[PDB]
């Protein structure tokens, strides 16, 4: 899709392998913010969003949590607390065969900057000048949607770049997108390191009498500490207590 | 331009600081455990410039 009207695909309830994307040689850029690219097969997320669009080569640096410019302000905004990765690669053999326009448009003019993950499609005429035309086009009144001119082999840095950005949702309903990890057996009444689909800790697990409602997975004791957890394969209600310690 | 200018696309894990890693061992970037040399999903890590 164009820079504006960027695609938004929802991914959930799957086993996600991120080593296939990182090992890909085509990807020219694979910046990851808030997460380590190597430590991505060990995590668990609730929802993953993939946004695909094509931009100009010099314009890739604007796809970052705290950058500014035409794209960041008017086309695609990333929140400063971004937790995800941006994947971009050069595609001059598919988007610049002839003319390169291929309905690749962007937004030069807008009244104000965008909010994070906000889209803005409008045929309204922008008034960049003194005279309030209040009509369509004319002098000092322009159409915001300007097309990309992708002349075949117009020098590196102006060639089309296809960008796919992934956003990882966290702190929500039980995670549905998880890495390719083989679950092991359940060990109780022993000081063991447990890994309950994202929640990592060390302690001893015992049978609990807590009556979770059928929609609660976690449990917080006083001082906001996680003391109870639900097994994601048998729905068992397990009690977590710290291992013995002292001076 | 090759002039024996090669690099390493594939490795099991990231390097330690100031650590060298020269190996002709075949990397397995795929599902099938070939456990031999090359083949599908089994590649030579050293790729030339």
């Amino acid at each position: 899709a164009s820079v504006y009207a960027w695609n938004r695909k929802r991914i959930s309830n799957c086993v996600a392998d991120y080593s296939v994307l990182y090992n890909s040689a085509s990807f020219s850029t694979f910046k990851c913010y808030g997460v380590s690219p190597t430590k991505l097969n060990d995590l668990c997320f609730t929802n993953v969003y993939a946004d695909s669009f094509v931009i100009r080569g010099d314009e890739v640096r604007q796809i970052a949590p705290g950058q500014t410019g035409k794209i960041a302000d008017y086309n695609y905004k990333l929140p400063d607390d971004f937790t995800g990765c941006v994947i971009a690669w050069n595609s001059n053999n598919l988007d610049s065969k002839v003319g390169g326009n291929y309905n690749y448009l962007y937004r030069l003019f807008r009244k104000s900057n965008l909010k994070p993950f906000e889209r803005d499609i409008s045929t309204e005429i922008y008034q960049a000048g003194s005279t309030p035309c209040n009509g369509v086009e004319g002098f000092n009144c322009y159409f915001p949607l300007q097309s990309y001119g992708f002349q075949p082999t117009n020098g590196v840095g102006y060639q089309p770049y296809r960008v796919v950005v992934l956003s990882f949702e966290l702190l929500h309903a039980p995670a549905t997108v998880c890495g390719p990890k083989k679950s092991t057996n359940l060990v109780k009444n022993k000081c063991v390191n447990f890994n309950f689909n994202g929640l990592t800790g060390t302690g001893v697990l015992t049978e609990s009498n807590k009556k979770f409602l059928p929609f609660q997975q976690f449990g917080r004791d006083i001082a906001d500490t996680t003391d109870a957890v639900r097994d994601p394969q048998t729905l068992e209600i397990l009690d977590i207590t710290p291992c013995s310690f002292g001076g | 331009g090759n002039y024996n200018y090669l690099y390493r696309l594939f490795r099991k894990s990231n390097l330690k600081p100031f650590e060298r890693d020269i190996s002709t061992e075949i990397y397995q970037a795929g599902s099938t455990p070939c456990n031999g040399v090359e083949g599908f999903n089994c590649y030579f890590p050293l790729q030339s410039y």
Partner: antibody, heavy 126, light 112 residues
Framework: QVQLVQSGAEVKKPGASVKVSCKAS????????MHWVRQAPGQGLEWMGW????????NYAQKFQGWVTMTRDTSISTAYMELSRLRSDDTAVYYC???????????????????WGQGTLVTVSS | SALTQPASVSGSPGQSITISCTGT?????????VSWYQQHPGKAPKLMIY???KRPSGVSNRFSGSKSGNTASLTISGLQAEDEADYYC????????????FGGGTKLTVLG
């Protein structure tokens, strides 16, 4: 774009050895596998082996072990095949063919034998 | 060795012609990397179907391919005068012996 040039037609006598060279152009020579195949006149196609331009790794067919050697000079981007102990039954046409990518890639497929060359007509007799 | 392919196939214009290619379990039953090539008389073979059906550039939508069991099929419908060429089947063989094999070939004679 992609184009491959073979050696000249080979004329030899039985009991000798021959070398077949494929010089490629228009693409990154060390980015794709190079395949060697043979075809008897009027018969079906047959496969010799492939060579990985990066280091020189060779794989040979079951029925062509011992008298097949795979080499290549990447400085001039040429792939060499060495055939030893030639016999009159091997009078055929040999092709150099391009395989899939030598590197793992998700935006690339697995188009085997995508591009072929003109071929070398080897003729051996008394 | 190779893969069993029908030796002779005759096709009248306007009908659908299917060419079979039977293999083994470790050849076609596991690796979906089969391909089909058209060899013009006196010209080097040109790639037609790189994998089961998916086609490269410059190939008409008429052509198609399929995989079932330990065999594959190449489908052509509405033959043209350019179809009077040899057709070949190939696949990749693994199981600790990475190599590839070809088929027995087939001669297609388009009428009309």
């Amino acid at each position: 774009q992609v184009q491959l040039v073979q050696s000249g037609a080979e004329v030899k006598k039985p009991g000798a050895s021959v070398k077949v060279s494929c010089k490629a152009s228009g693409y990154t020579f060390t980015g794709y596998y190079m395949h060697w195949v043979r075809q008897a006149p009027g018969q079906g196609l047959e496969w010799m082996g492939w060579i990985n331009p990066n280091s020189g790794g060779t794989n040979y067919a079951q029925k062509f072990q011992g008298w097949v050697t795979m080499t290549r000079d990447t400085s001039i981007s040429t792939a060499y095949m060495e055939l030893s102990r030639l016999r009159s039954d091997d009078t055929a046409v040999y092709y150099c063919a391009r395989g899939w990518a030598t590197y793992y890639d998700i935006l690339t497929g697995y188009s085997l034998f995508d591009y072929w060359g003109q071929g070398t007509l080897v003729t051996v007799s008394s | 060795s190779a893969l069993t392919q029908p030796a002779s196939v005759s096709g009248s214009p306007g009908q659908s012609i299917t060419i079979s290619c039977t293999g083994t379990s470790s050849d076609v039953g596991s690796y979906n990397l089969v391909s089909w090539y058209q060899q013009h008389p006196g010209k080097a073979p040109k790639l037609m179907i790189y994998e089961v059906s998916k086609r490269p550039s410059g190939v008409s939508n008429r052509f198609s391919g399929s995989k079932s069991g330990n065999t594959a099929s190449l489908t052509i419908s509405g033959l043209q005068a350019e179809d009077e060429a040899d057709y070949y089947c190939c696949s990749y063989a693994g199981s600790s012996t990475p190599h590839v094999v070809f088929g027995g070939g087939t001669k297609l004679t388009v009428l009309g």
